[PDB]
Amino acid sequence: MIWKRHLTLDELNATSDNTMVAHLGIVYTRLGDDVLEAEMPVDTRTHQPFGLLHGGASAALAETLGSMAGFMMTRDGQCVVGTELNATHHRPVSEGKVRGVCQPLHLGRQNQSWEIVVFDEQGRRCCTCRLGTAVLG
């Protein structure tokens, strides 16, 4: 696979401890050869004042996924940090939960780029994001 670090879903959902990831109901749901996935609830934790999925929640979901993916691409003595994020909101989400699908675009030695697409519970694309990360040391 692509990953340098080999971790289980249980282990991934364990780093979440008392952070924003956990705080937002984000759960890592799949780890494939070259893809990381997570789901996140659409309720009062992730709402904006009109009752729709807060665009900021999709963003945070994307930075989470890209960073964790970045982390699993590093050797034992390295850190990975999100440096650059962008996101396009195509469709509102009023109900259910969303799934984020993160895949590599560029896996460099000093920095990387990740794609994260966010789907609603009908598999409809609602948000496209890209995260650039920095590998340190």
Place this chain on the structure above:
Amino acid sequence: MIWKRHLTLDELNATSDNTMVAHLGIVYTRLGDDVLEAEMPVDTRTHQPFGLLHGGASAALAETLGSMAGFMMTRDGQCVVGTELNATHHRPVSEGKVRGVCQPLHLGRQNQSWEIVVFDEQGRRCCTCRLGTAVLG
């Protein structure tokens, strides 16, 4: 002021009820003639696994501010939605609060562009964001 809607901090902080805005502990601290500002905690609620401020938290604060600012430029009936978000993470923050400052770059009839700068307690710029919005109809 420039806002179509004459609201108050109290009015603004009331909209946060039962949303992601309240969940992240974000509170609007300044409503100026042409500036909106909110503060957000850097604690477990907004941390990432290294005990630093989660980049997605800064993003969520930015989208909150830009959207709220954008609503306040709408005549009754109209709605405002965030469409494009970008964010550059310049500096880590680990404790205290951060402050988001939102100002208009371009106020058009169907499209708006907002700048949100996020500062740490020393007043250093930690994150720069831009939010595109859509007015309808």
